[PDB]
Amino acid sequence: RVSLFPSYKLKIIQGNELEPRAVAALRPGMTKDQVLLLLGSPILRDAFHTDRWDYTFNTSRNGIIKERSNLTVYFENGVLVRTEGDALQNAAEALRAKQ
Amino acid sequence: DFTIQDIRVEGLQRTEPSTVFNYLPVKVGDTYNDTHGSAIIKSLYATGFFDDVRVETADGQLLLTVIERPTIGSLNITGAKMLQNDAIKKNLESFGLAQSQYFNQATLNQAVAGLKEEYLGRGKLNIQITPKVTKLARNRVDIDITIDEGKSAKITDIEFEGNQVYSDRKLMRQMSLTEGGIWTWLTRSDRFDRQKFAQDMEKVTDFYQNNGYFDFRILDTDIQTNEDKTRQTIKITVHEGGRFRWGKVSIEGDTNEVPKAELEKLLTMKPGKWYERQQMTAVLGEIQNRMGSAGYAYSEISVQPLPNAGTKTVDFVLHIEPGRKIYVNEIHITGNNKTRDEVVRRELRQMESAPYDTSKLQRSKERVELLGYFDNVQFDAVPLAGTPDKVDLNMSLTERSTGSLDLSAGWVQDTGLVMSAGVSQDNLFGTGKSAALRASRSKTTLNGSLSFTDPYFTADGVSLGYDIYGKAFDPRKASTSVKQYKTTTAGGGVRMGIPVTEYDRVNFGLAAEHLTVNTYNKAPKRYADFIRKYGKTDGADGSFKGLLYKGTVGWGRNKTDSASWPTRGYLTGVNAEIALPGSKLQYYSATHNQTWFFPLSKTFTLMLGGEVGIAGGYGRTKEIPFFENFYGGGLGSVRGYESGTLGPKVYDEYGEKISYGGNKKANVSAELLFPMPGAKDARTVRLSLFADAGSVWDGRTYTAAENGNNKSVYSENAHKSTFTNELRYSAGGAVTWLSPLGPMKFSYAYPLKKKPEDEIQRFQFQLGTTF
Amino acid sequence: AQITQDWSVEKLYAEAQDELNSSNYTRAVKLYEILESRFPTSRHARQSQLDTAYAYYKDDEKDKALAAIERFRRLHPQHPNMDYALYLRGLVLFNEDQSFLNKLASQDWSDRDPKANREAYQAFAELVQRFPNSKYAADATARMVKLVDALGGNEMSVARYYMKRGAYIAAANRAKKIIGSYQNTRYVEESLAILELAYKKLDKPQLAADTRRVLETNFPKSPFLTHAWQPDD
């Protein structure tokens, strides 16, 4: 279970993907279904603290983090309260670049 | 109103009225006038219970007279002439007709109608369909269909209208149906089927579509019979579009992450040829697989023509809708019995929650099919109530028998019989852990072997295995004997194997062996020098032994359909499997292959064979062993003369003629392969010719021999049998077939430039393959 | 019906018995229909169908077995023999596979199919809900617990192999469904441990600590509190 040998062949790992214009569409203060249709199905969803919906990314190599981008979002009583993460800004200049 | 009190259902035969009351939607003490009458009558009409049941109100004891529905206890079949008894039996029992099963007349009627329609669908119309009913015991009944088929249904005349664009002769040549003829008498090639008719219809319409005529408006078809409803005639009229030119097809829509520039790059359409229907289909396939390679299985393209006559061009605007980026929610696996689950999970991509792309999905298809553990596998996509972005991708498996014994015999032309043994095993009833026994034996050789391996030692997976061998060679045989001696090779080895990419995968292996080379009574100088240089002699004989530190390096890839039916693609690879340095006899030998296939016709095709390699070594030993020499000339070399018959035929004791050959391997194959279309499309018969190029050299010229020169000129150089890039002209036929019981060898050889020092063999035959 | 000889019911029963003892089946099965036609009002149909089902289990197929048994279920749903039927149903979908070539004393049974044990669970559930005092139910309970254990082991193995590939995201939902619908199973500690590994690999400190509190409240004692999880073998 040790001593990985020099195999220059690995599977292509993905973390997650999200479309930047949806980030541009992110307005605070609407319900779960509203943001659902705005974005789509989150890849994961807990239950005990189920306002944490975030996506990710990784072009990993043998399991090591290579790139990443995150945007957690919070909710109360079925409405958007806030969101934060590292992907919003880069999505912003990406949107400005292609538009 | 009346209340139910122990309904006295009478007139029953074997209805066990207890289960009747259980089947009754009402029980004792239930108030009833008319509500349940229809419900009960339809309930008993269902499940084939009865046919006439009456209910009345009479002091709680209602006389429910019932007549048992007939039940076919025993069924019989006859009239099966075109089809066998088993076929008709299964296709009838597919619609009920089991033991008893509460036979109904309406079931009879629907069944007979369906079968009649099935038969008339083929080329059978004047058919006598007369089933017979025999009343067996109280409930049992028998039926037997009687089918008296007509003579046949033959298509006499084929004719068309609007045939001003192409000659009916050429078009009828193009269409894949026959008419009356002498060579068509075989296999009833003039019969008719609706399905095959339609197939030829779309074929020819597409043919016209490629011919530049737009939309090829088919007007109508008609079939007309003859006397006795025996012979038929077909007439279809159509309307062509005329010649045109397409050079400005355009695309539109949204791309999201997709680059429109890449879209323009992939657009392979030009004004040349003015059109191609299948090119258009192919570009649609390319764009669609791209549109979903990003993870959009439901992005849809819309086509629409924009006509413009005079200039005779109709523009095509292709409007794409992307939407609803899709991931995968869960993977289910079917056909998992007798095997593990991760084992098939080892190979595919898209572990979960991944952008659904067919791009790597077909790669997974290929990856699992080359495993060969199942004949059929299907990949199934289904969403759930939580529809968006998540869909199940459960896949299919078809478990196939693999654990058996490899007891297979064959026959070879020279030695004779040969046998093979050992349990065939690749899967210890679960994960792969492929290990098996394989051995062969003949009057000239024997070799036992056990294999053991895991294809995946690591997460990506490395194939590690042990493998043993005990092969011994006994060239001494009957009159058709090559140089007589023995070979003693045995031992084990370890094989490691890693892929470097999806299409490239190498494998190495290091081990050590031992050999005891042995000689006989006086042998040519090529033996005396060898034995006196390393070996030891006793009397008129002698032998030698040595260590065999060997290394092996290899790589390969396949690109053809093959499966005993070669198709587009070829084999690529390189190998080096000899005793490498670290011990005596510092040697190196390469390997190559090319199996180019050209399926440019329906039956005729050609394959190009490719090989390059030098067996020469280096180091302390500057020579080449006799036993490491090539067996130039013969089947595996050129399929030409008898095996191992290239090079100088040396005189010796008794003045025989045995050659050596060189250590140069290079070959060029070109044969016109094709099946026989007389019988059917069975994967059973081929046919070709034999025309090969083979080069082999040693470098050393041979001039001194056993008091006699076997060459025309005293100064005959033995480096090459002829001029540079040596070869002998020869070409013959090759009757191929595929499988009487499997393996074969059959071919007719005709040489050219018959030298006074070479021997030929026009025909050769082998059975049960070799090795 | 090669001979269609007239005999008594017990003689036919004994002939069928020895045919099972002698692994003779075609005559054994084919005498059933002729005796039933000769003896319609007889209980021998039930024994005939059950023994044919047993033989088919001893054979590769079960389709005609199930055909006959639910046929009977439609025939006399009050003859208490149905307890065996559903039971052998669970048996026929169990596929014990009694063969010498594949003894494999291990035989985890963890490979048959999800459909088989789903149907087993539902069949034995109907059995117990309708026959809590059945002729035998401890075997039923053992069967359900063994099958659910096999299911959990299957999914846990899937997760750990994903970990061999580091498929953290998939294993997340794997664990969530394990705890969601696969309660009181032995394969929980490693599930939450690999869960912690995933979150820490995904840089989720607060939720990793929340799961730490969850596990310690549930499993205060476990070697993996101080042992970062590793794959076996």
From Swiss-Prot, chain C:
<keyword id="KW-0178">Competence</keyword>
<keyword id="KW-0732">Signal</keyword>
<keyword id="KW-0998">Cell outer membrane</keyword>
<dbReference type="GO" id="GO:1990063">
    <property type="term" value="C:Bam protein complex"/>
</dbReference>
<dbReference type="GO" id="GO:0030420">
    <property type="term" value="P:establishment of competence for transformation"/>
</dbReference>
<protein>
    <recommendedName>
        <fullName>Outer membrane protein assembly factor BamD</fullName>
    </recommendedName>
</protein>
<dbReference type="InterPro" id="IPR039565">
    <property type="entry name" value="BamD-like"/>
</dbReference>
<keyword id="KW-0564">Palmitate</keyword>
<dbReference type="GO" id="GO:0051205">
    <property type="term" value="P:protein insertion into membrane"/>
</dbReference>
<comment type="similarity">
    <text>Belongs to the BamD family.</text>
</comment>
<keyword id="KW-0472">Membrane</keyword>
<dbReference type="InterPro" id="IPR011990">
    <property type="entry name" value="TPR-like_helical_dom_sf"/>
</dbReference>
<dbReference type="GO" id="GO:0043165">
    <property type="term" value="P:Gram-negative-bacterium-type cell outer membrane assembly"/>
</dbReference>
<comment type="subunit">
    <text>Part of the Bam complex.</text>
</comment>
<comment type="function">
    <text>Part of the outer membrane protein assembly complex, which is involved in assembly and insertion of beta-barrel proteins into the outer membrane. Required for efficient transformation of Neisseria gonorrhoeae by species-related DNA.</text>
</comment>
<keyword id="KW-0449">Lipoprotein</keyword>
<dbReference type="InterPro" id="IPR017689">
    <property type="entry name" value="BamD"/>
</dbReference>
<dbReference type="Pfam" id="PF13525">
    <property type="entry name" value="YfiO"/>
</dbReference>
